[PDB]
Design an enzyme around this catalytic site. Structure first.
Site, PDB file in Angstrom:
ATOM      1  N   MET A  80       0.705  -1.077   0.014  1.00  0.00           N
ATOM      2  CA  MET A  80       0.099  -0.507  -0.259  1.00  0.00           C
ATOM      3  C   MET A  80       0.855   1.691   0.429  1.00  0.00           C
ATOM      4  O   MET A  80       2.249   1.364   0.383  1.00  0.00           O
ATOM      5  CB  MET A  80      -1.346   0.411   0.982  1.00  0.00           C
ATOM      6  CG  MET A  80      -1.956  -0.942   1.073  1.00  0.00           C
ATOM      7  SD  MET A  80      -2.166  -1.410   3.055  1.00  0.00           S
ATOM      8  CE  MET A  80      -4.201   0.180   1.784  1.00  0.00           C
ATOM      9  N   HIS A  81       0.245   1.814  -0.413  1.00  0.00           N
ATOM     10  CA  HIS A  81       0.578   3.485  -0.250  1.00  0.00           C
ATOM     11  C   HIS A  81       2.292   4.264  -1.110  1.00  0.00           C
ATOM     12  O   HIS A  81       2.034   5.568  -0.702  1.00  0.00           O
ATOM     13  CB  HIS A  81       1.161   3.166   1.610  1.00  0.00           C
ATOM     14  CG  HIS A  81       0.476   3.426   2.688  1.00  0.00           C
ATOM     15  ND1 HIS A  81      -0.562   3.790   3.212  1.00  0.00           N
ATOM     16  CD2 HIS A  81       0.748   1.997   2.991  1.00  0.00           C
ATOM     17  CE1 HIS A  81      -1.423   3.326   3.395  1.00  0.00           C
ATOM     18  NE2 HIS A  81      -0.570   1.649   4.312  1.00  0.00           N
ATOM     19  N   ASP A 236      -2.595  -5.260   0.255  1.00  0.00           N
ATOM     20  CA  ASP A 236      -2.041  -5.672   1.202  1.00  0.00           C
ATOM     21  C   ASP A 236      -3.291  -6.812   1.945  1.00  0.00           C
ATOM     22  O   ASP A 236      -3.235  -7.557   2.463  1.00  0.00           O
ATOM     23  CB  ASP A 236      -1.098  -6.678   0.893  1.00  0.00           C
ATOM     24  CG  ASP A 236      -0.463  -6.050   1.738  1.00  0.00           C
ATOM     25  OD1 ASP A 236      -1.094  -4.259   2.798  1.00  0.00           O
ATOM     26  OD2 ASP A 236       1.185  -5.222   2.307  1.00  0.00           O
TER      27      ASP A 236
END
Length: 484
Positions: A80-81, A236
């Site tokens: 992520m991110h 995830d």
């Protein structure tokens, strides 16, 4: 029919192939490296993602050529991110700035203090989220910022390679700090505050809905028989939860990985940033989730083992399979501060109650008890945000400790389900999301829980002693916090 899941993790790309009955058929891995040029930096070349994914796909196709060609849908999962900046021609302007990068601590502090961000995202703005990294780029790499035409998260860059479209799913995009999490739409207000517009974001879809088709050159490179649909996918965590069946309200899993994660699926958007819980969209439509983060769970035991010169498995083997009543030793696992529920960067770890009679095993026990108590602190935070956790499912490395599971069940007074052996993680959730988009099946009928291997019930005899020890652990924090 066949379905392929691609998990783009930070350490590698996992490829998982499953049939119509969600039985694994084969799996392959492609390795990834992390570049750390300066303190706090964590980067990756998006080209490395593609080479790793190409490695695992062809390695899978070369071992199951006829089954691979029967793939009808593909599902994606990603770390992520991460911030992937593309120019007008989709060229990568700079390496992707990953979730564990902290170079933007100043910019995230500035954004977190703007009350719009918790109101619109429902989350604290940490430096590993996407929004603060783009303020960082505007200030320190301004030539790169001027050329930004798209900002993509890692799995969505992989989708750009696979499908040629710019699309993201709700669960991954709630981690950008640009999403109105409750509305499942981009926030123009938050985008403007970091210097971008909505036209520089990908289009949004639900993770389980169809979100691109495989490019023809790729459909022929692996000999694909049919029109291959690519699913929205998930980050995830949400991907992992789809693999685990954690999609109905009140269903939760606890991950005893390097960091602890308590993941609860929600029927509505239920933010509580005041207690430092994360609230993100799930991969399924009209579905959300909460995330309690314990910054040191398994790494707290790794830390202690390096001190005493053993391995976690030996310390776990020395402590045994039978739960013991807590002793006078208490462990606060705040070796890196703590996130949920105090969001305290200055606090640190502690052993208390040390006696001459405390041996190595007694301190091992207090480490497991203390992480269990942090999980109970996390469950209390989720409950203050409208969630009641009835049944809990345990995964991650630490879940291989029978002692740890009995400790967590007795600390929470909930049973803990231990799955049968298999891969029910992010790559399996991605395969499932691919199955859902390709068939249009109801996503809740697909994302089923795995078969339970053993069920660890709370030790009724030790419930009271664990409360007494929990209260000791809880009283230690405000006492030590007063000293910071």
């Amino acid at each position: 029919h066949m379905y392929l899941g691609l998990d783009l993790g930070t350490s590698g790309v996992k490829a998982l192939l499953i049939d119509e009955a969600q039985n694994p058929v084969g799996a392959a891995h492609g390795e990834l490296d992390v570049s750390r040029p300066h303190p706090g930096w964590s980067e990756q070349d998006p080209a490395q993602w593609i080479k790793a994914c190409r490695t695992a796909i062809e390695a899978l196709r070369a071992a199951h050529p006829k089954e691979f060609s029967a793939i009808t849908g593909i599902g994606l999962s990603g770390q992520m991110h991460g911030a992937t900046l593309l120019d007008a021609e989709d060229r990568v302007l700079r390496p992707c700035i990953l979730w564990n990068d902290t170079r933007s601590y100043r910019e995230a502090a500035e954004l977190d203090a703007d009350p719009a961000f918790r109101a619109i995202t429902g989350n604290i703005v940490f430096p590993g989220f996407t929004a603060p990294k783009l303020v960082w780029v505007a200030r320190n790499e301004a030539d790169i910022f001027a050329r930004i035409r798209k900002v993509l998260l890692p799995k969505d860059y992989l989708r750009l390679w696979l499908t040629g479209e710019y699309i993201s799913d709700m669960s991954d995009s709630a981690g950008t700090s640009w999403l109105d999490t409750g509305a499942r739409r981009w926030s123009a207000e938050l985008l403007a505050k970091t210097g971008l517009g909505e036209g520089q974001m990908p289009q949004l879809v639900e993770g389980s809905e169809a979100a691109g088709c495989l490019r023809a050159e790729l459909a022929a490179e692996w000999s694909l028989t049919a029109s291959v649909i690519v699913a929205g996918g998930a980050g995830d965590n949400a991907a992992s939860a789809c693999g685990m069946g954690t999609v109905k309200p009140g269903h939760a899993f606890v991950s005893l990985g390097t960091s602890g994660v308590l993941f609860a699926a929600n029927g509505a958007y239920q933010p509580k940033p005041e207690s430092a819980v994360h609230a993100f969209c799930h991969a399924l439509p009209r579905t959300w989730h909460q995330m309690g983060v314990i910054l040191s769970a398994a790494s707290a035991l790794e830390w202690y083992s390096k001190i005493v010169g053993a391995t976690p498995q030996s310390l776990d083997r020395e402590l045994g399979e039978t739960l013991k009543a807590p002793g006078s030793v208490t462990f606060l696992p705040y070796l890196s501060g703590e996130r949920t529920p105090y969001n305290d960067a200055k606090i640190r770890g502690s052993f208390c109650g040390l006696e001459h009679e405390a041996d190595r095993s007694a301190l091992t026990q207090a480490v497991l008890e203390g992480v269990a108590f942090a999980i109970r602190d996390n469950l209390l935070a989720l409950q203050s945000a409208g969630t009641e956790i009835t049944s809990l499912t345990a995964v991650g490395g630490g879940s291989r400790s029978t002692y740890w599971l009995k400790a967590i069940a007795t600390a929470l007074n909930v049973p803990i389900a231990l799955p049968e052996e298999g891969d029910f993680g992010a790559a399996f959730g991605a395969a499932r999301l691919g199955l859902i988009a390709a068939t249009g099946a109801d996503p809740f009928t697909i994302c089923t829980p795995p078969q339970t291997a053993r069920t660890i019930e709370p030790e009724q005899a030790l419930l009271s002693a664990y409360d007494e020890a929990y209260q000791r652990y809880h009283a230690l924090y405000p006492a030590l916090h007063a000293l910071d």
